[PDB]
Symmetry: C3
Subunit: 111 residues, 3 copies
């Protein structure tokens, strides 16, 4: 199992959501964050570093779904301009659905 | 050492907090997030985000089952949307005031 | 690659930022959180209050770096964030398998540099 955390431009949330869902993702968590990358929050063209509003998407999936999730995030979030965002993939040891106590694959599965 | 991330309904925070603390688990970070699961945010083909809280609790391996047990007991109810728990590895923990590491940065006293 | 997740006092963000960027660590994500540590949100602790718990506002900083930069990052956060009082903060380091820059599709080292 892996957690895929992607930080993207806020306006791109709707496209990303639809792309992931059409590819069979059935679970995701979003929050609002502030960040900067290489360009220190500057869109123009003095080292005054600024934060911009971004959305952080977190999606837990089995290993065989990882490439698909990354493909759809990249296709939905990209515009070609600096600040398009970053994706981080990390291990998940165990997943549990609280209502039923199901584990791992079963806790990750559809309706 | 492991991180336990639980996404629960916001109004269950107080029960979870009490369940965990009575069992000796004393350190937690909480954040407001929005989410959906396999019902795609429906309480009744649209997809909606609902308000949840994310709890993050870092503990020693020996305490993981305890943390899961208490979060489940406090937050399970029987209605869809009760939440989901993710367990991941932590390689190092450091207490900023002291520079204490690992087991020492995670326990009391 | 590791993710460094540092929970600190909100007023220490600026100093932590400057110290990271001056050290060539350029890229971070910040968010507002609430928490307690072993003092359970209490700076005044009373008989029986061990089982009461208050949440305080903190800031969570998340910084993904290469393995070789982890000590530098911890050092800089600890020096900028430390006040000497309970509640100064706590840092969690965890593995990251992959990092990808969305704009270019570049990966790992090149997506952190
Ligand atoms: N190393 C990092 N650690 C944690 N968060 C990061 C890191 N790098 C970027 N971010 C987060 O990702 C958001 C988007 O970063 P961004 O797309 O600017 O990356 P970049 O490497 O500068 O690529 P680009 O040259 O395309 O702008 C940032 O504003 C910040 O929230
Ligand atoms: N695979 C996942 N990745 C990331 N977040 C998820 C995932 N599954 C669920 N979540 C998050 O956890 C919250 C609670 O999920 P939920 O309790 O609805 O799980 P479920 O699998 O749909 O089970 P139930 O049938 O009991 O509702 C979601 O709103 C979302 O924030
Ligand atoms: N084990 C933990 N898991 C998750 N979050 C924690 C943990 N311990 C601390 N935190 C987060 O870190 C913040 C600051 O912790 P703090 O510095 O109070 O830790 P401490 O162990 O109590 O040390 P001090 O004795 O220096 O207070 C907390 O408010 C909470 O957000
Ligand atoms: O995030 C943006 O829109 C531009 C700023 C940027 O790319 C950065 O700070 O790395
Ligand atoms: O989270 C809820 O309150 C109900 C909707 C749901 O369970 C879901 O989206 O998976
Ligand atoms: O966070 C503070 O400033 C004091 C309370 C504390 O240290 C804690 O809850 O562990
Ligand atoms: Mg950038
Ligand atoms: Mg559900
Ligand atoms: Mg404390």
């Amino acid at each position: 199992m892996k957690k895929i955390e992607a930080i993207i431009r806020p306006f791109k949330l709707d496209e990303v959501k639809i792309a992931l869902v059409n590819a069979g993702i059935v679970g995701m968590t979003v929050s609002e964050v502030r960040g900067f990358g290489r360009q220190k929050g500057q869109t123009e063209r003095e080292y005054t570093v600024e934060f911009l509003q971004k959305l952080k998407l977190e999606i837990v999936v089995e290993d065989a779904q990882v490439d698909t999730v990354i493909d759809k995030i990249v296709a939905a979030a990209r515009t070609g301009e600096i600040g398009d965002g970053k994706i981080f993939v990390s291990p998940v040891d165990q997943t549990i659905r609280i209502r039923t106590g199901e584990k791992n694959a079963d806790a990750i599965s559809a309706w």
